């Protein structure tokens, strides 16, 4: 049934964006649980649950980019590292490729080293939907991180 999941998503979404403090550790615990909730709902059989969780990811990202990118991008990476179902993987992949230009020079080297194993796993997959998302993601990820690579890391890619 769509109604239970739609109402749960929209409730968690509205609770997180309406909260003004945006900086406590308990808010970051709740935020991780919401990124897990919406990226799970991105894979649901019911099309309304997918559409709502996509709108909730886009809302909660744009509501928090001034305050919590260093956890929004961590949870999107924690989904790409799992190598899961096509929809939840894609729902993290294209979002992480948008947010890649906002990452600090202080963290580009860590994120590249952590993403090379993900990029060389997601490249193996038979799904043309995942491969067409990866074709949009690589040009944006490498424009953000490609100066932080060693020559051997480029060759492995």
UniProtKB/Swiss-Prot annotation:
Which ranges does the UniProt record give for the HEAT repeats? 110-147
Which tissues does it occur in? Expressed in the brain cortex (at protein level). Widely expressed with the highest level of expression in the brain (nerve fibers, varicosities, and nerve endings). In the brain, the regions where it can be mainly found are the cerebellar cortex, the neocortex, the striatum, and the hippocampal formation.
Give all N6-acetyllysine modified positions.
82, 140
Family, according to the entry, reads as follows: Belongs to the huntingtin family.
Quaternary context: Interacts with PFN1. Interacts through its N-terminus with PRPF40A. Interacts with PQBP1. Interacts with SETD2. Interacts with SH3GLB1. Interacts with SYVN. Interacts with TPR; the interaction is inhibited by forms of Huntingtin with expanded polyglutamine stretch. Interacts with ZDHHC13 (via ANK repeats). Interacts with ZDHHC17 (via ANK repeats). Interacts with F8A1/F8A2/F8A3. Found in a complex with F8A1/F8A2/F8A3, HTT and RAB5A; mediates the recruitment of HTT by RAB5A.
Q: Which disease is it linked to?
A: Huntington disease: A neurodegenerative disorder characterized by involuntary movements (chorea), general motor impairment, psychiatric disorders and dementia. Onset of the disease occurs usually in the third or fourth decade of life. Onset and clinical course depend on the degree of poly-Gln repeat expansion, longer expansions resulting in earlier onset and more severe clinical manifestations. Neuropathology of Huntington disease displays a distinctive pattern with loss of neurons, especially in the caudate and putamen.
Domain commentary:
The N-terminal Gln-rich and Pro-rich domain has great conformational flexibility and is likely to exist in a fluctuating equilibrium of alpha-helical, random coil, and extended conformations.
Q: What is this protein called?
A: Huntingtin
Name the species this protein comes from: Homo sapiens
* Residues of the whole record sequence present: 95 to 251 of 3142
